[PDB]
Amino acid sequence: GAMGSMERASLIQKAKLAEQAERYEDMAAFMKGAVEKGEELSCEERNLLSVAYKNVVGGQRAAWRVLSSIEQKSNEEGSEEKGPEVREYREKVETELQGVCDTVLGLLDSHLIKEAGDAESRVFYLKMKGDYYRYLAEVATGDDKKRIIDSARSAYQEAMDISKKEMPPTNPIRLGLALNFSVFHYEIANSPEEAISLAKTTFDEAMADLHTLSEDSYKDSTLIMQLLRDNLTLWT
């Protein structure tokens, strides 16, 4: 690995600097290097890993959507032929996106998930597995699309089962998992009713547990609850 010669602590320090500088590709490379040291990640370090790759893949997804829309318009009736360039460039961006997803999934499989025994870490990583399969599903069109969708579903489901047994209904990781799995149902699995039911049930069960929380915990949980409500408003 490119970061093999840098201390773990230095990689973490530089990931934080990269975040401050909005250098998310660098941040991701530093965090990949940190993971490859082989030690488990702390809570803070999990957040850094997430933030880095979310920003990288988020930019790729946005670009892919722009290019896909242009490509769709080119294939409309009465649209003038412009040659292979739109498809080629969409394919280039797509391949880069898939490479980032494969990188993340590789870190989770080697060996973050298998060493994660605490509920918070295991749910966090399985949620991430579901998310990155979801991103692969967004661009899939071939004979593996169904299997990619099922890989996302399976990861989310395992995370859900653990979260319901081991975490309170207000736990931010549990809430964020439910938010994202609900979006999977709506956008990927063609199951809008399941999406809506999950978001509603999650919201309501969290509402009922808010009374147990400190001011700081309340802030965290209510922020994510509002995202659930936002999606519900979009969908109903």
Partner: peptide, 5 residues
């Protein structure tokens, strides 16, 4: 697009 975290 819907919200995710």
């Amino acid at each position: 697009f819907p919200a995710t975290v």
